[PDB]
Design a protein around this nucleic acid. Structure first.
Ligand SMILES: [Mg+2]
Ligand SMILES: [Mg+2]
Ligand SMILES: [Mg+2]
Ligand SMILES: [Mg+2]
Ligand SMILES: [Mg+2]
Ligand SMILES: [Mg+2]
Ligand SMILES: [Mg+2]
Ligand SMILES: [Mg+2]
Ligand SMILES: [Mg+2]
Ligand SMILES: [Zn+2]
Lengths: 51, 97, 113
RNA sequence: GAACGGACAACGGCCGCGGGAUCCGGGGGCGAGAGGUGAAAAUCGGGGACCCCGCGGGGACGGGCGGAAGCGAAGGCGGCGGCCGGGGACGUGUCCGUUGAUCAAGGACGAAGGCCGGAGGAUCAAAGAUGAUUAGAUACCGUCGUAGUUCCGGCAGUAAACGAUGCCGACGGGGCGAGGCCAGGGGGCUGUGUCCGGGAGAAAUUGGAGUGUUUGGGCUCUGGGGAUAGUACGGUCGCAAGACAGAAACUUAAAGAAAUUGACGGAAGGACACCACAAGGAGUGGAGUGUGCGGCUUAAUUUGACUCAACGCGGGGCAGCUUACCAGGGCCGGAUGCGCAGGGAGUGGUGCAUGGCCGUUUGCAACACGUGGGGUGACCUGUCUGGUUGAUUCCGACAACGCGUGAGGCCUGGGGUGCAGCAGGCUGUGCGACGGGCGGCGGCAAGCUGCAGGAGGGCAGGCGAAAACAGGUCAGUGAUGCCCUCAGAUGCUCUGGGCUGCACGCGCACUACAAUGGCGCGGCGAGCGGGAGUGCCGGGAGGCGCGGGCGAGGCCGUGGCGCAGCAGGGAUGGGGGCCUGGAAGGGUGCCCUGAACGAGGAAUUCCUAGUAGCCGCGGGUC
């Protein structure tokens, strides 16, 4: 959770009142951290191939 | 709506079936609508059957059966659990186990 | 405790892909699992490798109807090829009951009641 | 339509025979209760009940067999035999030959209850009477009891008189049944149920409710939104009760049908939990005190919150500040655009205008999509019969298949030790447990359970789905809409007072009621937290000067007291000494006074192992 979802809060003041808009976004896994977390989610596993 | 195809009783091609009295409630239920459970069990209960073997005068005494037709009205038959709670599709079962 | 589909479908794949490299002892059965997979956390390895041993015990008995192993049908086709005692040679002068012969009265052979 | 044949028949009317049961009378036995109920009472019982056995009388009623079985036009019809009468189906080279179908009017029959006259009266039982229940109980329950229930002659003419389905007729799928007659070739007629399809239908369903917008077989009746109302008037019928038939004025935007999802149920069955219970432990409620809430008071005793989810909560331990309140006094953060405009400020109002956050449902296990299927549809399946799990966790069967959140995995601490590094030892890196092994249940099993091995076999936390709630917060906010206030201010600030008032109600805690104790010495003494000790003065509190630097109740040993409102208890109060602060109602220390309380009513909380409880210590606040 602390790696993969980054969440935001911005508040809006209008004629009528206050509006709060929360945006929470899941990140894609990428080994280079420019796009997302390097370590995978713990439940996901990889199996190699027998041939 | 019409809940049962036979309307609860077994009356078909009659106008009138004579009422009987409930064995538990003394209600007036027709003989067709009434829940009837014929119980045939031994007079002496099965726990005491070893104690009657020691006490009989007779070699190979057979303990007699008790014959009774329990006839229940609909209200007490679900209360005495002579009829079991079933589903809507389970209502159309007719066979005894 | 009860394993979930994240473990059971995983451990089903491990015994299915890599059956001959496995064994009934758990610690050897875990030692293949770091060598042949990538599982991050060491408890969840023990969740998987434990159920692999609980699978490999009953697949050694061959009880599961789902998974399919290359060794286990080639041993099965030897069992499939029974030395055939087919009753087509064992039945001689076939006893067919009284009305069953009457339907074959156009072209007939081996007549017996 | 008529005849005939062999059958069939709870079809009717009558006559005769019979059956046992209820009740009563009477005799004999027995000897204290019986009855009745959820529990009892009423009631009957040494004047012999109940119960047991015999006899007798009388009325009513046909159990078992007895069924989706028969018959009748319906109401209805059930012991047996007989008489008289009827009936349909079947069978037929019998007769007649269209005699038919349906119906206003009319006629007959018509359950129960009711009515009239007569007979009878065992049971049951409206009314009535009681005994209870209940807040009440005119009821439900118990007992008694009249009409009635019964028969005969008549009236009446109604029922959820139902298949809620008019009669006649043509056509229309299979299966299974336990009818009757015929045939002898899983047969035909005719009844009768049932199951699955077709078609129909708003759907439930349905062999007609089918052959209907591809709308036309005949005939009769009825309906036209709900309510008024099956009421009134008039009529006819009736001994009467009433029946038949049958409106309107006024009023109303729905009433209704079938089904879906919820929710609920004093419905049945599960599952689960120390806001459950059992088995327990300690309590609370009683006492005094501390604190919170209400009420009252007050210049003010600011205010939010009132079932869990208000009430030692707002990190709310308030002397000022805090602080919103009261009594006063100051001060103008009244900018800026030419006295006005408007900004700004407000612990002023509104959390029922909001954001955010938090609580609660949760201490839960639920939620959803893609596609497909079922249905006209809402919806359902997926998301489940069963088994399993803390878990919609999984096994499995499956019109579903695949996925996704949550659960798990996970993260932190805890124990065991491998290596490494360094110095009340420290911190990196790993390993170690998965329910693995074994035994028994369950077996595609999931799993459950016992033992061994083991440091460890449900460790403690953390994050915590979708949906909600008019939950709480505008008094955390330079988070805020709107409303109100802005110079004699609802602004800020200062001083004083209050938030600490007290006939009272309540929550949570504290200390106790003592001997398993208390008091006085000696001895041994923790973890979180790692900053603090030292020397001197003082009886203590405290003070002063240096200054890298800590450890508890208790327990053990022992001395006194010795069941006492007592050396238990330490409330209240008096006098003195100090600390902090600008300021004591604060804290501390000394002496003295020495309250209730002798085990705490109805109620009620928490808790399964290093846990409850007891016992201190440290930190937040300061
Ligand atoms: Mg009837
Ligand atoms: Mg006597
Ligand atoms: Mg009558
Ligand atoms: Mg009568
Ligand atoms: Mg009379
Ligand atoms: Mg009576
Ligand atoms: Mg009239
Ligand atoms: Mg309905
Ligand atoms: Mg002030
Ligand atoms: Zn009954």
């Amino acid at each position: 959770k602390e790696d993969y979802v980054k969440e935001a809060l911005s508040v809006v003041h209008l004629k009528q009142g206050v509006i709060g808009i929360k945006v929470r976004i899941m990140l894609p896994y990428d080994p280079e951290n420019v796009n997302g977390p390097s370590k995978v989610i713990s439940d996901k596993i990889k199996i190699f191939e027998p041939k | 709506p019409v809940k049962r195809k036979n309307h609860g009783r077994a009356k078909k091609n009659r106008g009138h079936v004579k009422l009987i009295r409930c064995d538990n409630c003394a209600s007036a239920v027709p003989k067709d609508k009434a829940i009837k459970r014929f119980q045939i069990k031994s007079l002496i209960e099965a726990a005491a059957h070893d104690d009657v073997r020691t006490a009989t005068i007779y070699e190979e005494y057979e303990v007699p059966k008790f014959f009774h037709k329990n006839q229940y009205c609909v209200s007490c038959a679900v209360h005495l659990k002579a009829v079991r709670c079933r589903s809507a599709e389970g209502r159309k079962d007719r066979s005894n186990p | 405790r009860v394993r979930n589909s994240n473990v059971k479908r995983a451990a089903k794949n491990i015994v299915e892909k890599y059956f001959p490299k496995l064994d009934c002892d758990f610690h050897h059965n875990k030692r293949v699992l770091e060598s042949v997979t990538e599982i991050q956390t060491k408890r969840f390895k023990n969740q998987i490798a434990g159920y692999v041993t609980h699978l490999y015990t009953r697949v050694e008995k061959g009880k599961v109807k789902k998974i399919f192993i290359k060794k286990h049908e080639e041993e099965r086709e030897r069992r499939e090829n029974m030395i055939p005692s087919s009753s087509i040679m064992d039945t001689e002068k076939i006893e067919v009951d009284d009305i069953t012969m009457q339907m074959i009265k156009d072209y007939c052979y081996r007549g017996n009641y």
